[PDB]
């Protein structure tokens, strides 16, 4: 497509939904409204940044999925927050 050969497969909306997947996968947020909190805003910003970075890094859509899922895995493996998150 435009920025990558695979680009046309993944529009902003899917990027947004994937960013949400990052947020919930890292931090299974109780309520969408909670995303307004500055703490969450930072995590949202992080997830956007990371997703963008992965998009530009990924030679192929499959890779984009892989290194994202891997990154999530690393986050939980390292930071292991899933259930704690709230705190």
């Amino acid at each position: 497509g435009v920025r990558k050969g695979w680009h046309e497969h993944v529009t902003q909306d899917l990027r947004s939904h994937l960013v949400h997947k990052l947020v919930q996968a890292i931090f299974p947020t109780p309520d969408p409204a909670a995303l307004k909190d500055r703490r969450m805003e930072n995590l949202v910003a992080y997830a956007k940044k990371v997703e963008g970075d992965m998009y530009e890094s990924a030679n192929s859509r499959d890779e984009y999925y892989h290194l994202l899922a891997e990154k999530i895995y690393k986050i939980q493996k390292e930071l292991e927050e899933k259930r704690r998150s709230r705190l």
């Binding site: 899917l14 939904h17 997947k21």
Partner: peptide
Amino acid sequence: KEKRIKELELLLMSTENELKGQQAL
């Protein structure tokens, strides 16, 4: 463990499939 690995991984991967599946609303 393995189940958790695959769930956490799959959660991300699922998205496009879920979306194109839910071609309704």
